[PDB]
Each structure stands twice: as C-alpha cells, then as structure tokens.
Design a protein around this ligand. Structure first.
Ligand SMILES: [Fe+3]
Ligand SMILES: [Fe+3]
Ligand SMILES: [Fe+3]
Ligand SMILES: [Fe+3]
Ligand SMILES: [Fe+3]
Ligand SMILES: [Fe+3]
Ligand SMILES: [Fe+3]
Ligand SMILES: [Fe+3]
Lengths: 170, 170, 170, 170, 170, 170, 170, 170, 170, 170, 170, 170
C-alpha cells in the first residue's frame, strides 16, 4: 500500500467533512417553513456526524505521518466533494438535491478508501467503514425525503450521536 | 368467569399485538417523503408499544394456565384484528387509514376483555386496562393525523416507553 | 427607579405568561393533521417555557414587596398581551399568526422591563433579560414557520427546558 | 354513560386544578416565619401536583370530544371548588384551613367522577382514581398539620413528582 | 362499607407482610448448596417486596383512622397468614412448600380485600390490587420452582423493585 | 473470644433493630402538627437506618454459625433495648424522650460489642463500629431536638442512606 | 455481487430472527423447575438479542431496495432455520437441544452472508458479522449447558443488550 | 476604571465570604431545638453558597493581577462585613438577626461592585451580579424567617447548589 | 444601533471561531513530547469551546437577518483574527505564543461587540459577554503557561464544556 | 513494627491475589453445565474482587518503601497461597474444594497482617481489614455451596464491586 | 480518656485543615508555567480534601461537647501545623517543599489522635483514621513529585472526592 | 485455517497482555517527579486497556477449543513480547523506550493475527482488529512522548475505557 496516496485520500476526505460542516449549517438554516421543519433535524444530524467524521479522520492522518495543510483555504480546496452550496432557488426540494448529491459523493469517497485499504491497512479500513456506515444512512435519509423510495430509517435519537464512528472519538 | 374463554381472548389479543409488530414495520418504512417524515416516529412508537403489549400479555396467559400455540402460523391466524396490510396505493392517507382501523380494533379488543373481567379477575382487568390506555392514545394519534379532530396528544418522549404497561414489563 | 411602576410591569408580565399557559394549551390541541404535527412540539415548548416564566417572575414580585392579585380573574385581566384566542378559522396558518403576535407582544414586554431597569435594578434586569432570550427564540420559531424567513433555530431538546431562565427556577 | 355530562365534570375539575395552581402560589408565599417554613414545601408539592392534574385532564377532555372554554375567565368560573383565597387574617392556621377545605372539595370531585365512570369508562375512571390518590394524600397532609390526627404521611421526595398521575403525563 | 372491618383486614395483612419479612430472611439463609443458589435471589425479591407491602399498607391504615397495635407481639399475632417457619427438614423442596403456602395465603388475603372494597373504596382497592399483582407473581415463581408448571416469569431485575406497589412508596 | 456470647449479643442487637423498625413507624405517625413536621423526617431516617442495621447484622450472625430464632415473638423478646412504645401522652416532647432513650440504649449496645471484639474479631468490630457511628448520630439528633444542646448535625440527604453501614449492605 | 440473491439471504435471515423471537418465548416459559431456573435468563438474553437482530436487518433490507413480504405467514415460511418447536418431551435437556440446533443454524446463516459479502458489500458484511458475534456466543452458551464443554461465557449483564449489534440499533 | 480600587473591593468581598463560611458553621450548630430544625438547612445552604462565592472570586482577583494576602489573619481582617459572631444570647431570633445583618451587608458589597464596574468591566460585573443574585435570595430567606414579610422563596433543592454562580465554578 | 455593522462584526467573529477550530487542531497535534503533554488538553479545551462559539454565533446572525457567506473561502477570509498558523519553528514556546496572540485578538473582538451593543441589543450583548468570559479564561491559561504570571485557572473538567456559552447551545 | 517483615507479608499477599486472578479465570471457565451455571457468577465476583485486592495492595507496598519484584515469575513464586490449580477431575464439587481452600488461605493471610499491624500501622491494618471482609464473604459463599452450611450471603449485585475495598481503589 | 484533651487535639486539627484550605489556594495559584501545570491539579485535590476534613471534624467536635472558638482569628491561631506560606522564592520546588512539610505535619497530627483514641473512642479513632488515609496519600504525592521516590499514586479522578472521609460527609 | 496454530497465537498474545498488566504497574510507579507526572496517567490507560485485552482474548481462546496453561509460570513464558522490565537506569526516557518497544511488539502481534485470520475467521479477525486499534494508539502515544513526532492523540477520558474492545467485554 502507498501511504502517500492513502494520506491524500484521507486528507481530501477530511476536507470534505470539514467544509460540509460549514455548508450544512447554511442549508439547515434555509430549510424553513412547515415543510422545512421536517428536515431541519435530519440536516442537523448529518451536519454533526460529518463534524465527527472530521474529528475521527485527523488522528489517523497524523498516525500515518501526514498532516493537515498549513492554511485553511488550502484545506478547503482539497475537498473530495464539490461544495454543497445553497441553491439559487432554495426550495426544500432543491436543498434536498444538494444534500443527496453531497452524501452520494461521500459514499463514493469512503467506498474508494475501503477498496484501497481492504486487507492491507486494517485500522484505516475500519475507520473508513465506520464513516461509510453513517454516509450510507445519510444518503438513505435524503433519498427517501426526495424521491419517496423507502430507506428504512427514521429520526436519530439525538443529532450527532455517530453510533458507528463513536469508538474513534474522544 | 370462564378461564378457557378468557384465555382465548388473551391469546387472540397477543396474536394481534405480535402481527402488528411485523405489519407496522412495513407501514413505517413506506411512510416516506416530507409528509411521511411527520408520522414515521408516531408509527414507530405505536409499533414498539404493541411489542410491549405482546410481552405483557404472555406472562398472564401462562399464569392462567394457557400457552402460546405450537406454530407461529397458528398464532398469527388467531389475531383478533385483521392484518394491517400495506395498502395497494400506499399514500400517507391510505396508510393512516390502515393504522386507524387497526387501533380501533385494538381498542375494541381490550374493551371486551375489560368488560369480561370487570370485578372478577382484577389482575387481568388491570392488564387489559393498561393496554387499553395505550390503544386509546394510539387511536387518538392517528385519528387526528387523518381527520384533523383534536386528540390532545403530541409526540411521545421516546418510542416504546409504554407509560401505562411498563409496570407489567421486565 | 419607581418600584410601584416596576411591580405593575412585572405583575402584568406574569399575568401574560399565566394566561398564555392556558391559551397555548388550546392552540396546541388544534394544531392537527399532518401539517399540525410539525408545530405541535414547538407550541408545547413555548407553552412550558411560558409557564416557567410565570414561575420565575413570582418570586421577584414578592422580593420587591408586591403580591399577586387576590382573584385569578383580576390577575388574567392584567395581562400585558391580549388573549391568544383560538382563531375562528383554526387553520395552521391562522394559529401561527396568533402565536407570532403573542410572542411579539412578549418580546415588547420584556424589552420594556429591561429598558426600565437597565443599570438600576440588576437582578430584575437579569430576570427580564433571561425571559427575553426565550421570547426572542419563540418569536423566531413562529416567524420562520409562518413566513419562511430563516430564524436559525430548530427543535429544542425537551419541551420546557428554559435554558436561559433555569437559574431562576427551583 | 352521558359523555356530555362527563365532559362537564372533567372540565370543571380541570378548572379547579388550574385555579388552585394560581391560588396555592399565593398561599405558599404567605406561609411565612418559623412555623410557615414547615408547611411551605408541603403547599408547594400540592401546588405542583395540582398543575400535573390539569395537564393530565386536558388530553382526556379532548379524547372524549370536549374542549377547553375559549376564554380563561370562563374557564376559571367553571371551577368545581370555590377559590382558595388568601384569608383576611393570613395566619398559618387560617391558611391550613383554606388548604384543607380545597383538598376536601377535590376529593369529593374525583370521587364523584369515579362513581360516575365505574365500570363504564375505564380510562377516565383510572385517570380520576389516579388524581384521587394524590388528593387523598394532600387532604391527609393538611388535616394532620391542622388537627394533629395521624395521617401516615411525611415529606414527598421532590415537589410535584405525582407518583400516581405520572403515567398520564408527557 | 364498614371501615372498622376494613381496618382489621388491612392490619392483619400488614402483620402478615411484616412477619414474612422476618421469616423469609431465615428461609433465604437456609436455601443452601448448588440447588439453593437458584432460589436464593427469588426468595430475596419476595422478601423485599413484602417489606414494601408493609410500608405501603401502613399509611392507608392511618389514613382510614386506624393504628398499628401498641406491642410488636400483638401485631405479629394478628397476621392473616400462619408463620412461614423453617421446616424441620429444611430441604429446598420443603422450603419451597412453605414459600408457596405463604404466597397462596397472601393471594387470598388481598383477593378478599379487593372483593370487600370493589366499587366502594377506590384508593384501598387500588392498593390491595397493587399488592395482589406482586403476590400472584410470587406464587407463580414458587409454584413453577416446586411443580414445574410454567408460570411465565423469570428473574426480577433487582430484588425489591415492586413495580406495581412503587407508586404507593416514598 | 467466646463466639456463643458474641452471637447472643449480636442477635439481641438485631432484635432491637428489628423491633425499632416497627415502633419508630408508630412514633413517626404520631409526630403530628406544625412542630411534628420538623422531626418526622428525622424519625424516618433513624427508622430506615435501623432497618439497615438489622439487614447488616443478620449475615454476620450466620457467618459466625448462629441463626435467628424460629419464632418472631422469641426474636422480639430478645431485644437488648426496651420497646420504644408510644407514650401515653404522645406530645412531641414525650416522643422525643422515647427516641432519645432508645438511641442511648443502642449506643450502649454497640459500644459493648465493640469492646468485646476489639482486637479479636476485626470483621465484627468493624460492623459494630459502623452501626455505632449511625447510632451516635441518631442520639445527637434527638438530644439536640429535645434539650437544645448543639449536636453538629442537620438533615440527612435522603432517609435511610446509612453512609457508614452501606458497605455491609447488598 | 447479486443484490437479489443477497436480499433473499437477508430476508430469510430476518424471518429466522423474527420466528425465533416467538419460539424462544415458548421455550423460556417451559424451562421450569430448579434446573430450568438456571437457563431461563440465558434463553431470555438470546431471545431479546434475536429480536434486536430482526430490528437491525430490516433497515439494511430496505436500504438495498428489498422489502418484507406482504403477509406475516409468507415471512415466517421464509425462515432460514427450521422452527424451534417445543419438544414433545420438554425436558431441560431436550429444550437445550432445540436451542443449540437453532443457534448452530444461525451461525451458519450469517457465516454464509459474511462469505457472500466479504470485500464486496462492506456495510452488509459488517452487519452480518455483528450478528454472527452474538450467534457464536449464543451457541457457546447452550453448548456448554448441554455438553459441559467450556465456552468461556457467563451471564450477560442485562438480557438483550446486544453489545455487537447495538451500533445498528435505534 | 481603577483596577487597584477594584481589586481591594474584590479581596474585601472574598474575605467576607471566607469568614462567613466559618461563622455560619458556628451559627448553624447553635440553631437547635424544634424551631432551630427549621432554619438549620437554610443556614447550611447560605454557608455553602458563600463558600462558592469565595471560590468564584479568587480566580477573578488573580486574573486582574491581584493576590490574596500572605497571612490568613490579614485576610480575615479585610472582610467588608463585620464578623457574624454567635450572639451572647443565642436564641433562634438573635441568630436570625445576625444572619440577616450579614446578608444585608453582602447585598451592599456586591451592589457597590456592580455599580463600580457597570459598563466598564463586563466579566467582573457579571461575577458580582451572579453573587448578588444569591445574596438577595439569602437576605429574603432570613428576613421572612425573622419578620414574616413574604420573600417568595422556599427550600433550595440541595444546599450549596449556587444556581447563579455555578458557571464561574470549576 | 446599525444592524448591518453589527452583523459584519458577528460574521467576522464567527469566521475567527471557525478557522480557529481548524488551526488549533494543527497546533494541538504539534504540542508533542513531555512538555507538550501538559498543554495538549488545554489547547483541546480552547479548540472545542471556540467551536461552541461558532455554533452560538450563527443563530444570532440569522436572527438579526444576516447570513453566512456562500463560499467557505469567503468566510475564512472574513476572520477578525489572523490565522493561527503553526510556527516555522514549532517549539512549545512558539506554539504558546501563537495561541496567546489568537486569544488576545478574540478578547478584543468580543470586547468591541460588547461595547457596540451595551444597552442597545441585550441579547447580542449577553452572547458576546458569554463568549468573552471564555476567551478571557483562554487568554489567562496561555499567558500563565508562557510567562508564569498567575492566572487563577487550572484544568477544565472536560474539554469543550463551555460553562458560560452553554445556555446558547442546543 | 518491622517494615521489612510487613513488606514481605504484603508482597506475598499481592502475589496470591495476582495469581488467583489468573487461576480463577480457568476455574470459572470449567464450571460448566447446569450446575456450573449457578456458581460461574460467584467465581467471577471472587476473581474480580481479588484483582481489586492486588490493585489496592500495590500502592501501600510502594508507600512503605517496597517494590514489586522485577520478574513476574519471581512474583508468582512469592504467593502466600498455593496455586488454585484446576483439579485433575474438574467436577463442580472438586472445583469448589479448590476455591474454598484458596479463600481459607486468603482469610488466614489477611488475619495475620491485621494481627501484625493492629495498633501499630493504622493505614495498613485498615487495608488488610478491608480485604479480609471480602475474603470472609468469599469463603462463606463457597463453603455454603460445598457443604450446605448457611453463610448468610447471596449474589453480589455486579461482579467485582468490592464494597469494602473500593475506598482504596482509583 | 480525657475528653477535654481530645477536644483540644480535634479543634487544633480542624484549625490546621481550615487554614490549609486558604493557604493551598495561594500555593495552587503560584504553581505556574509548564512544570506548574503538572502539580496544579494535585494541589487542588489536596486543598479540597482538607476542606472536607474540616467539614468532617466539626460535627465530632460538637458531638463531644466542644465548640469552635468565637473568633476566626483565635481559630487560625490554634492550628496544629504552621502556616503553609507561599515561599519567598516561589519556585515549583520551594512550593512542593511547603506542601510536603504541611502534609507531614498533618500525618503526625492524626497519628497522634489515633494513638490517643485507640481502643477508647471508636468513632473518633475511625474519623482520625479516615483523615490519616488521605493525609498519607497527600504526603506520598508531594514526596514523589519532590524527591522521585515512588509513592504508588497517580491522579485522583476528580479533586476533592475524599474516598476515605466521604462516609463522614453530608 | 489451522485452529491449533491460531490458538497458539492467541494464547501467546494473551500471555503478553497479562504480563504487561504486571510490568506496566511497575513502570507507572517509577514514572516519578514533575516529568513523570505527565506520563503516569498515559501508562495507566495503557495498562488497564491491556488488562481488558487479556479479558477479551480468553473467551475467544475457549470458544475455539483452547485453554489457558495450567500454571501461571508456563503462561508467562508464552508471552509473544519480551518482558517490559524496569530499566537499570529508570529515567523517564528509558521507561518510555521500554513502553514504546512493548507497544510496537503488540502492534506486530495483532497485525500477524489479523493477517492470519483475514477472510477466514471473522470473529477472531474482528477481535484482533479491535485490540490492534488500541495498540496502535498506545504506540502513537509513547512515540510522541519519546520522539516528538505528532501522533494525533491526547489524554483518554478515563483510563481503561477501551473504546474499541468494549463490545467484547462483559
Ligand atoms: Fe461525513
Ligand atoms: Fe414567556
Ligand atoms: Fe388536584
Ligand atoms: Fe440501629
Ligand atoms: Fe439472531
Ligand atoms: Fe456570599
Ligand atoms: Fe472563541
Ligand atoms: Fe487534611
């Protein structure tokens, strides 16, 4: 396994989690009205779990001999998912589209890391898998809200509980 | 009081609670979209309390010298309420109709047991009354969601808390 | 500072909180249907925090040498906000209008008390400010639900937690 | 059973609980001095449990198709117990007399509802019985404090815990 | 209803609960060996719940204008169940026989009180019913251990939790 | 050390604790009125800790090869303190006199056991000392209430917490 | 990976967990007598964890685009383990044989799913592995009770805690 | 603002809090008898909150570049309130007089600091205000106990909870 | 008061808190070795409280009709404190210098907001003051670690507890 | 007192506790079958408390200027009790014999230390006494299981709680 | 035993604990810099436990018929340990020297009380022993920090937990 | 997979964990002085987690049909890591070297087991991975303390929490 390549993947993933923490704050605040009130708590759970994902990734990056970039702007520019901007027409549907696209990119990111580390870096694989669990659940949430396809999920107990990633958190 | 007749009522009630636990799982998963997100937690609270009702009824059945049927299929066929099938057109309204009809049947079932045991089997009466409390609240929930008639209820704290039946639970 | 004038303001504020506790009970029970299910918990949090506000104001009234009026009807007639009656056409929108108008009046009431006591009665100012915090949040809640303007708030953890007024509560 | 008559009883009971919540606030604040310090916590427990009784009665009123009156003054005028006014000579003994008379009226109110619903409305009977438990304990408290007749009770753990009515509370 | 007769029943019941608390201490300590280790915790749960039953009955006795007898020996002599003496051959089977006989007598005692107070003394009926719940469960426990007839029960969580009588306890 | 003599002391002590549990129940219920309300919780803490003392002594009696007497009447007759009867004139002062005399006898009982076991039976000494701690505090409580001599104590947090004996309790 | 084949495996596994929840209820209730008292809590822990396994599998089935069958009878007929019927001679040994056979089938079921998803469906693999952990422990429990071969396990803290599957539960 | 003058005020206030912690220990221990039992817990809550006030003031003194005096005697001599000596005739009334006078001095001390720092030292102002809240409540307590004027307060939950100063405590 | 100017101050403050959350992550990870082990937990508490400060500021920004900038890079560029870069020679002393300079800038930022809103925007003033409390404590921490001047502080209980800002957090 | 001799006793005791932690692991795992299921939790409580005893002894050894031996084999060879080997015929009875013999040796060890330190080394005496409490209870447990002599004990709440030694544990 | 002599010892000990509470506050605040950050929490634990020691000693002084001196200065002058002044050169080493000397004096004080009360005043002996436990641990802490001799201790969980004295605390 | 070879690996790993529990006790006690105070808690967390690792490995060894060796000396001799002896010159640096070498050996041990069981023994692989997580974190801790290379970790909340292995613990 190429630790330099792995470190780039992990840093790009951490950048996506960090920027998502900011952009989902904006999206949550624009999920207004009666229909917005349904999804506001769901966005908040996704936002806080993505913050947890950033917190879980940074120790592994440093364990592997990597480091966060010096400038926060450099870091944001490394994000492996495009920025989850507030849509120009911020309807609930358009916001859900942004959220679903972001979660689908995240699922792809950690699937790629899991594929890269499978049977080679057990600790990193297990960390990527833990985050992948939560991203798959996020993607299921938003896909159901947007398309009506049954996801099998309903409200998390308290936002940001991160049941799969918690063992990596301090 | 005819313990054999009482046992049949209790077993039929337990069968209805058990099957409801399965069928409400399906119904919860098809309460999708923005409007489904409102009622998903309400279905879940009803589903988990009906599981509690099954757990509360079984000890009383055995205390009275009865027993569950040998085969799970026999048991399901004994249910005193018709199966809460997913409707062919699973809109939120059609799902609510199934839920309301099921809860109304449950209210009838425990009202019948309470009438049968009033002043004759205090422990069984109190158990039937405890479940009846929760069924009346479930029926109120779904009737309000479906017809807009004020029920007087809003979200339970945590799903499955069963405030009335808890003293019967282990 | 004129303690007699201050006492009248505080008693009128306490009357508004007390009557709101009653009228919001009615409003919560008529927020029915799928769209009502969104706002029912929000009304309940506002109702329980306004009950807390009454509980926090009464000790200060007595500390300052005032007292509640002898008759509950006299007390209700002193309310500094007009009664939050159920609207003749109790749609969710019309209910939200009543709630928003009540919260806006409350914000005005405690802003007036804060202005009257600023730099003169520190304990009363701090109490009025604590309640003002919660009224501003209530007003933000309902204004977002009604107009879609981003308020920055989403569901309180448990209704009636009163994070700002709790230090005044027993 | 005549649901209209039952609803009137329940609303009148709820009015008595609501007004008691106000009037006991006044009574608690005038139970002063060394001897008042004994009974202040007892009044407070009674006051908070009567608030719980109001909270428990309202859902049942709405379940049965009733509603609270539009105006808080109408509601107060419906109270089935006369107003627990602060006595003109507010000695501890005179305050205890008011409290005992109020609790005795409450015991009568819920005894009447229990008699009306016995074997006919199990849920309402059980609710009336739950409140009756707490009223009988309140009456015992104050009768002992006033006459020295042994009641068998001593301080509740925390005021407002409502051990009998809690299962009806949210 | 004849309060004097009711008081005698309640005092005799309280005496049985009090003496059982002592005699079950002896029985628990003689349930030795590998087979005794099974039932020791079951005896302990029964013993502590019977202590709770004594604690729950005394306030009601005093509420009704009765009192405990002056001398503890008088009290013990009033017990409505014969003393649960350690058997002359204290085998596990012989101990279980004593326990089952005691619980069957207790079930009879509270069934008699429930019959006497049904529809006449709601608070006392509810107290007798609460204790009856726990006695029926105790009788089921020991009957299963002794005869193998399925009771439907297994270990209580913590001994002395008294799920049915707790609302009467301080 | 003479284990037979030690066992007699321990059984007589356990009998005193057991009977006190009964007699203090009566005394607590007759500590009525405004002045009784002060000491009711203090009696209750003493009563529940003396119940704990009985629970702590019985295992040690059995560890040492002793056993409780077969009949509860035999047991009560062994009490090392005379019965704490309700006084013929049950004033608060006369009740306090009974309580103080009982606690003084208890202090003497465990002082005697500590003297007998000092440097010879460490486990029994430590158990007697643990109970002695609580008896000395009880005696201080009642002596202050009766004579005004400063004891240095004020209300225990929750009655029956037994801070010194808890390590011996299950 | 063939999602249709995977879905069939998962649904058949969920059916086995669901039916086990019923059949283990019967088995627990027939584990009577002194020797049954040992294993009753062990059956109960297995039963509640198998209920948790059903709850954990259903969301994954829906995430993958599958659904539970319409009728509860269809569902039961899909179970990948034969029904754990009460044996015709329900001795403790014969009951243990049924339990061990059921757990061995479960171990086989999740081993097959893990083999099918290894390195291909990380989330499903991790879910199957989590359940496999608990099935291997169940099989160890019952094999030790039946054959005396050391399993390395002793009583779970509280039944149904599911330490391995909890992260999948809501 | 003159930090040297402010530091002197804060150190003198801290000295008063520290010495009060000692002197209220004496006063609590001499609040004996039946009437003393009422106020003992109130003195204890005041004593522990004044200890908290000392703990809250010291960090601010050091933050501002001040320090506690080298010798504890120097420190005690700086107290801004005269020593709360046990009165020569330590009746409950005379003790209450000492307590009320001490609390009135404390209210004056923190009112002076609040006036000195208003709009100039926000952190110190907020700290002085937090302590002032608790001193005003203490003064209300003792004034009611002594004169019967309604204060609006009753027993704090647990002594020393310091609801207003807690945010400054570690 | 000029809400546009106030909004710019608040957004610039929120940007500083957000970027600090990133940069302190880097600084914490480079506080290595035996001497670094002392300050690592202190950096972590500062980092998590600054994250809390961002979370507390955003709702107020939206309440006042402002919004976060569309792009995370725009946001970072608005920070009112220069970026807390890892020093080119990352010794513990040089890291402490960066931390102290950042905290001093933060103290200045919230002092400016408090000055701008004093007596004009009570809610915003109280929020700025709450954050100012924590920044003053952070500055004290690092100044003591760097210069040895007594600050009066020692380790926070758990990192990120934010005792002053918590009432603003969800 | 001869600290060198005392240190040897304490180190030999710590060695016995440490080795017991290992050997009881083996014994617990071989207490199989239906009869083994009774005693498995009892062995586990003894094993975890003996681990606690090792943890409590080591600080005292170092306080007195002693140290653990360099090599773990040297340490094991110092054990004051012979190794609790799995018996060649590992029946439940033979295992109980090993356990009882080990506990009897432990009781002797701490009795010797208590005798050596009585009135000379209070801290060490109190530590030895604390462990002696738990060893006497362990010996009682196993003696009852093996011989049927009443011990007075039944299941500890949670294994390893060490109620007597806890004050020495970190 | 001479209670007057014992009272003088106890009061002198309480004075030392009280003054230490003040002087250790100063010492903690001057344990600055990177090396001071290690010992600051250790000083704080010692300081809070010595406050607990004062709280534990005062009730015993009053139980024995003693009393605290009228003036706080008299009290401080009675301290059995010389004042733990901040050293003229307040280096970490010089501060540790003061702390170690103070703890050594405390160990001597309670060793003297234990010697005086051994086998004569069990309650006082046990109290002195409880404090002696904590003083020996404090002395071990500081001696290790100062000289490097292994003490066997590391950080207490939370400062002021007083595991040995807690049973004497309210 | 060769279960005999796997069992040898697991037993050798368990031996290393067991001996580490002893040797880290010695190392922790010799990490003295101001610089030792930093790492003492880190050693303690590693020591308690390695004890947890032993507890987690033993059930798996028995599940697979293996057993611990008869004699504790045989067991210690099987350790897969050389004994972590206290260095002849026990400086903090030399102690850290021993700790780092031990953790590096542990990382190698569980990496080997993971490699051996990957895709063949899922339960054992997951157990080895869980321990590997904690060993990698331990190695990171000590490497940072020794070399200054950023590890990304700071103090665990409470020592011995084992966030990754907890699901395997009872
Ligand atoms: Fe994420
Ligand atoms: Fe309000
Ligand atoms: Fe009421
Ligand atoms: Fe006692
Ligand atoms: Fe399963
Ligand atoms: Fe103060
Ligand atoms: Fe900040
Ligand atoms: Fe001390």
């Amino acid at each position: 396994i190429d630790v330099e390549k792995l470190l780039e993947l992990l840093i790009k993933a951490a950048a996506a989690e960090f920027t998502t923490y900011y952009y989902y704050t904006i999206l949550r605040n624009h999920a207004t009205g009666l229909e917005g009130e349904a999804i506001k708590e769901i966005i908040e759970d996704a936002r806080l779990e993505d913050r947890n994902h950033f917190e879980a990734l940074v120790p592994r990056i440093y364990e592997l001999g990597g480091e966060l970039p010096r400038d926060i702007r450099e870091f944001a520019d490394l994000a492996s998912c495009r920025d989850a901007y507030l849509p120009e027409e911020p309807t609930i549907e358009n916001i859900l589209k942004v959220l679903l696209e972001a979660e689908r990119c995240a699922v792809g990111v950690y699937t790629e890391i899991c594929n890269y580390t499978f049977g080679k870096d057990p600790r990193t694989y297990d960390l990527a898998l833990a985050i992948l669990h939560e991203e798959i659940e996020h993607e299921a949430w938003f896909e159901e809200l947007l398309t009506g396809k049954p996801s099998g999920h309903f409200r998390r107990g308290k936002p940001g509980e991160s049941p799969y990633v918690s063992k990596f958190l301090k």
